[PDB]
């Protein structure tokens, strides 16, 4: 039940505790930062404030101001009028309180508090320079093949999914790109439930009994169209369990001249089915790469009801760090509010949540101990428009708060998949 | 500048499909060089006369959250009755809708107008899946008001008795609408969870004849 492993390696939840338990509070108003001390006895005499402004990851300004705050007191810090941003994007402000001198309990340079705000945002209005290339639609009884130069997209007409992609003669997928509404159950999803003594109120059991894990996709529609400068693929699927429709998924794929695939997804969720664990897509990628790069919340694991500690910046970690090694394996390694993701030859743009690793949701839920896991061929990807909270007020009864349950009935998300 | 903002056209293309015609548009609302709103739409007209409209709006994070995200027009038709499947039968808003019930409702046009002595936005009905007026039918998941008075007349006139009915019927169909508040009437009182602050909004509508 610990915040740390038995060998004292931190769980991701330790960072969330550090941030919420901070001793300095911050408000922003125009160009003024207000800092409040929550110390009862000491002055801030080993503290200074580092601030920085970045446009979509790229720094534009930074600076330092010594902190001089009495117990329970306030200090007003006025930012210099900041250089105007050139292009489009959202400006972000980050502050951190740094301890310059070593103590009996910390190293010099130790970070004790932090906070972020959105500043000015300029929206992209200018039409991206209209390219000339034009994608080529090839139709057979079993498939739709889209070709742009030497890039190839294959849609299966029987199953209704993007079943393979090609750059030249190099294939990208080991498993087709499909919808996903399930996660490998966390301890909070399971609670005190067991094979010998089932607890029907637990999230895992409501999910099992409704047939979420056994749901079979059934194609409703699958059409292909040529436009002026692109090809459009329209699909619709029903997920059913023994006659009862659980979810309907409606998608458009738009592949244009610049070689980008715009995916638009619209999902309906039956009001009387237990709210699903996630609403997204998954596939098994052929490529295994070293690093993972993203513009979003990080660097550590973060979930919708546990993402306050994470900051919005540009992050770059090795693949093995995007997986959290819980002793009892479960869904893990998510990062939220991501605008861009980069892995090997692939780039994904939008506003989504993701995890990425060598283990599939199926392997994670079938294995009881972490040492028993084996890396699978390629890399398993999950990209969710929406993901249920993880809870934790206790681990023996539903604890996910109402504002974190996927309960809206109708959902929308869009992604762009291209090459970097 | 929300009231003074002018729609600038970014894109407007047409494509013929196997069974339909698809119109794509994009607009940007600006004031003194700042982009407030961007609206991206597709209209799809299929073989059965139905028009499917898809809208995606971006709102600038540093502009004050908008009062509504929707569409308007002035219809030529003046009909006796309004018929809808949604919350009703009385006026209801996102932070004042619990009393309303979901069902099929049917009222004379004049009932779709609340005669507040000082005139303002009035008459909204929320959580609607279907609206009927004359030979028109709208389907989706939206909020609406319908009346003989433009938002503009309503905002320029000070006493209800000084209002005059306009030719035809003004229709407002919103994907989203800001709460009304009222914990008091002398400071901002709309609670955070009823402000339109998500930055990106999506809604869809089918328009047909019946
Ligand atoms: Na008025």
UniProtKB/Swiss-Prot annotation, chain B:
One GO BP annotation of this record: lactose catabolic process
Question: What's in the keyword line of the UniProt record?
Answer: Glycosidase, Hydrolase, Magnesium, Manganese, Metal-binding, Sodium
Q: What are the record's GO terms for cellular component?
A: beta-galactosidase complex
Q: What induces it?
A: By allolactose.
Binding-site residues, substrate: 186
Example GO molecular function term?
magnesium ion binding
Q: How does it assemble?
A: Homotetramer.
Q: What is this protein called?
A: Beta-galactosidase
Which protein family is named in the record? Belongs to the glycosyl hydrolase 2 family.
- Per the UniProt record, the site (Important for ensuring that an appropriate proportion of lactose is converted to allolactose) maps to 186
């Amino acid at each position: 039940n610990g915040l740390v492993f038995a060998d004292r390696t931190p769980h991701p939840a330790l960072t969330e505790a550090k941030h919420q338990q901070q001793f300095f509070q911050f408000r922003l108003s125009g160009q003024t930062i207000e800092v409040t001390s929550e110390y009862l006895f000491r002055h801030s005499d080993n503290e200074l404030l580092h601030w920085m402004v970045a446009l979509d990851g790229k720094p534009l300004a930074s600076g330092e101001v010594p902190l001089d705050v009495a117990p329970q007191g306030k200090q007003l810090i006025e930012l210099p009028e900041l250089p105007q941003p050139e292009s489009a994007g959202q400006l972000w402000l980050t502050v951190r309180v740094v301890q310059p001198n070593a103590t009996a309990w910390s190293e010099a340079g130790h970070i004790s508090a932090w906070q972020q705000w959105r500043l000015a945002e300029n929206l992209s209005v200018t039409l991206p320079a209209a390219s000339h290339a034009i994608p080529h639609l090839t139709t057979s009884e079993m498939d739709f093949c889209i070709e742009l130069g030497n890039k190839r997209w294959q849609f299966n007409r029987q199953s209704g999914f993007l079943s393979q992609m090609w750059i030249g003669d190099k294939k990208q997928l080991l498993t087709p790109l499909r919808d996903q509404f399930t996660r490998a159950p966390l301890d909070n999803d399971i609670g005190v439930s067991e094979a010998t003594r089932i607890d029907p109120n637990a999230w895992v059991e409501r999910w099992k009994a409704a047939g979420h894990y056994q749901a079979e996709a059934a194609l409703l529609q699958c059409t292909a169209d040529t436009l002026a400068d692109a090809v459009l693929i329209t699909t619709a699927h029903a997920w059913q369990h023994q006659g009862k429709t659980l979810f309907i998924s409606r998608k458009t794929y738009r592949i244009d001249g610049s070689g980008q695939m715009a995916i638009t997804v619209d999902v309906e969720v039956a009001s009387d089915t237990p709210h699903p664990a996630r609403i997204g897509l998954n596939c098994q990628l052929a490529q295994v790469a070293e690093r993972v790069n993203w513009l979003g919340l990080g660097p550590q694991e973060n979930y919708p009801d546990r993402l306050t500690a994470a900051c919005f910046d540009r992050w770059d970690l090795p693949l093995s760090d995007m997986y959290t090694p819980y002793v009892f394996p479960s869904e893990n390694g998510l990062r939220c509010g991501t605008r861009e993701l980069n892995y090997g030859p692939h780039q994904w743009r939008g506003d989504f949540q993701f995890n990425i690793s060598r283990y599939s949701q199926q392997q994670l839920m079938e294995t009881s101990h972490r040492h028993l896991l084996h890396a699978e061929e390629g890399t398993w990807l999950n990209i969710d428009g929406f993901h249920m909270g993880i809870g934790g007020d206790d681990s023996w009864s539903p604890s996910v708060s109402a504002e974190f349950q996927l309960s809206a009935g109708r959902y929308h998300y869009q992604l762009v998949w291209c090459q970097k």
